[PDB]
Design a protein around this ligand. Sequence first.
Ligand SMILES: CO[C@H]1O[C@H](CO)[C@@H](O)[C@H](S[C@H]2O[C@H](CO)[C@@H](O)[C@H](O)[C@@H]2O)[C@@H]1O
Ligand SMILES: *[C@@H]1O[C@H](CO)[C@@H](O)[C@H](O)[C@H]1NC(C)=O
Ligand SMILES: [Zn+2]
Length: 1016
Amino acid sequence: QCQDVVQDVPNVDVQMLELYDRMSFKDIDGGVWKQGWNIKYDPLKYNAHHKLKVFVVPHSHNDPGWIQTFEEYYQHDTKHILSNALRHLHDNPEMKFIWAEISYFARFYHDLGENKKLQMKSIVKNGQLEFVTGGWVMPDEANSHWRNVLLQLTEGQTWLKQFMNVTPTASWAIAPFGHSPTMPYILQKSGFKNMLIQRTHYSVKKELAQQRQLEFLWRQIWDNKGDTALFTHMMPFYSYDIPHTCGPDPKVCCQFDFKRMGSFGLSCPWKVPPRTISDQNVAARSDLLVDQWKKKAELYRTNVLLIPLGDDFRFKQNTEWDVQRVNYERLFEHINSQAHFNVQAQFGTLQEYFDAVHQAERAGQAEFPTLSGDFFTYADRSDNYWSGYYTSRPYHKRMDRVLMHYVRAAEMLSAWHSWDGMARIEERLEQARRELSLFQHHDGITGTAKTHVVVDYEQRMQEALKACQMVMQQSVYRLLTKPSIYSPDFSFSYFTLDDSRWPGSGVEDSRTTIILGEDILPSKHVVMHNTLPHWREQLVDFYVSSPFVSVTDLANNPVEAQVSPVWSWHHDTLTKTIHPQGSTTKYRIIFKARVPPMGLATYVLTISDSKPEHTSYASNLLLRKNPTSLPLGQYPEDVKFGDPREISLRVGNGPTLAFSEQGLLKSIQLTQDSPHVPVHFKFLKYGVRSHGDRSGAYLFLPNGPASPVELGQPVVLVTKGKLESSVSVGLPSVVHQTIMRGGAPEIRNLVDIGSLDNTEIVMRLETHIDSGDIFYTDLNGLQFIKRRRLDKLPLQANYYPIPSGMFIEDANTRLTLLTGQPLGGSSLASGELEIMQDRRLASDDERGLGQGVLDNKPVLHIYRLVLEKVNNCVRPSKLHPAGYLTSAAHKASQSLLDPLDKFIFAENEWIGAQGQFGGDHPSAREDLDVSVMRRLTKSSAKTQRVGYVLHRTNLMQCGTPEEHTQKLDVCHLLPNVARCERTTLTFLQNLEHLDGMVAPEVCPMETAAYVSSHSS
Ligand SMILES: CO[C@H]1O[C@H](CO)[C@@H](O)[C@H](S[C@H]2O[C@H](CO)[C@@H](O)[C@H](O)[C@@H]2O)[C@@H]1O
Ligand SMILES: *[C@@H]1O[C@H](CO)[C@@H](O)[C@H](O)[C@H]1NC(C)=O
Ligand SMILES: [Zn+2]
């Protein structure tokens, strides 16, 4: 019995969209608490029978890359922090410390001798050192895909379970730039009971503090019942540093950061230094500190107070451990002995804080409010909204999504078999998982690291892509070769991957041409993989050395194909134009591949001396004044030329698209009879302020609304084919392409911002749709949340992450834009959508990076554009905070994020080749995905185990029957099943032993994990 995620509006105490509509967002000087007020407390609130219990929680924020690389920080800082934590905690049994980033901890632990490993395990087992979250990193929450948030969580927690025998149930996220409800969603399904966040808008902190709503049960926006709820603590102040964690007055709190007295090269900007605690000052010092604590305690509902004690890369030097510990010990001894304070203070861990809060709750001392919504877009002060990092370093944002899919496909393809250790499958997959996991860091995918650190992340991800390719192609060879013939060399390349959209045409010449010829090689096998659990057809393309190529399946059935030229665009420094050149040596062949659920399909490409019966050739039309010829080698159809003009295209029975004379979409007509709906693409530019605060990697501070890019008279190329047509235009900084294959168009932008300093390029869609001030954007590729433009906030506050899509709608019409990469975007006026393409910024934005963004490189952004009639759809009510995709939009998103994978057989002949794998796999209902398939055991395990993460989205009911699908039971995908268990999403805890060894399908918007055990 599934909860209805559409028709029941949850009743919550705080709903963030509603809160935003009501709040004034005034930025007034609140006094010492600059963004709050002067807190008052009744000194008689605490007495002998009701004391304030204070947990001082030492911590050290360690960025896995930011200003230095991961390895540089490890050598210079983190290895010392961890080595000294081990010594100091061992020697001081009441001292405590929390640790978040398992990438660093694993890097350290594996370099320890056994003696030290044992000492480390002992300070963990006794609770002095406590892991918080236990992910590989502390991830970004804006740009990250939920699948990769889960991947990195699993990587860190699997390491902790194996080596430390612990699994954290409290999360610590002090640093991501705004916070997403995807986090409690994943954490609550991974055994967590509590979480902590910090970087929320200063106005939200003030509002919630006033109502004592900084601790709340955070549920998903659609969750009527509350089963997704996770207890959440929001910190109240401007920073997680010591000046902003003891209480509301940083001039006072800074005096209790004992690293700031001078010899460490640190000081207090409020001009009052810390003083060493002595018997002659401890009473006065304690009075000041307890004062701060009791003020902070006024903001919360229990008598249990959390005081973080730390900052970036703290607790390095032995002298620093001593100075913080000894001074706090003197304070605690005094405070705890002086009845008049009515305080019991101690070093603690995060879990100890939460346990004590919940003890107070059970004692009936507090009830907590319920909350739904998100915490974007963050501003830390004034109008400094952190919407710039939704776009910064977009090449690597796109690379994240490519590697996301590669990791899934490599793990899935190799899961079907057990592999010998010599095959190095587990080794390559662990490397790939860890490099993608590292990049989820809040200075990785966010694009907020120094140039050489971005380079490090890129090199790591490139190695991870090669690892995935190796595992994938070994797996394909095994799955599709007759078993008695299969003779693997585990170092050999049986196949190479062919990827048409990464790095992309015009980004890198990386694609191999299939070289055929009468005097060399008549034919070539290619294989497609489909990681999705339903049959899929999709056009696929390969480069070939002749236009006279035909396609067959492995039963030798002809397959209809289309050949087109290979076009590349060149900024001609002679003529000062951007125009295409066609290859005279290679050609593109395109055909529909039909591939089983989670399966493989083989095809053959064969050369002939002349036009094959089942291959057609696209026409090509170059629109420009003053054309010159465009020879195409053997290509059988001459290029046509014309002056710029409006054009219309229709592929199959799909929509008819009309384009301006500048090659940009102007309208879509869904069906023969239907209207030509205005849908206009436009490119614009934002600039930077010449006075006041400057945009940088983090902040978007535009100097007003965007101005149209001056287009001149651009060259437009039209390719018209039976299977695929396109319009491409060379605009300043963007080669913009609209591709039609018979359904929703695909948009590709090759974006090269070149040397345009202090410029952000935006792609806008203008329509008639009466959306008003409402639009929808996704959170981590998991859910769509309703946004409301607010004219009381500046432009940059109305920008939100677009990690996978966005839409606007009215009563009748919806326009959805799906993305293959996370970027920033908004709807700044009724009927508009816009999404930032790249940004190049000369200035630092005072958040610690110490550089602008001047390392741009060409990137190929990909999208799908879905215009739909929605008046017949069953949509949520006007008060519901969520929205949901249609079937077509969801499929278009899957097309972008998890396309078919293409393999080209490397050798001349593939002996023992088979035509298909997975023809007997169940074809599951369209809303269900097998997000993860991963074998969990190495070959020496008697009982093999395979883990599956199943996710069911929720698609709108719009009157399409779309029926008959097969039940997917992941537990019977592999033979000889002996047991099936439901587990946490990390696979680390068994939750239910399943009857009949059958894994049930999940409810809409739910994600479940299962592990099947096999005795073979
Ligand atoms: C201006 O911020 C600098 O000082 C504060 C202390 O109040 C530090 O928190 C940060 S470093 C911190 O935040 C940046 C974004 O500002 C992030 O990129 C890093 O990962 C860190 O988490 C600054 O040094
Ligand atoms: C892992 O933790 C639990 C703690 O109760 C314990 O039963 C188990 O023995 C531990 N495993 C060890 C210490 O190897
Ligand atoms: Zn950080």
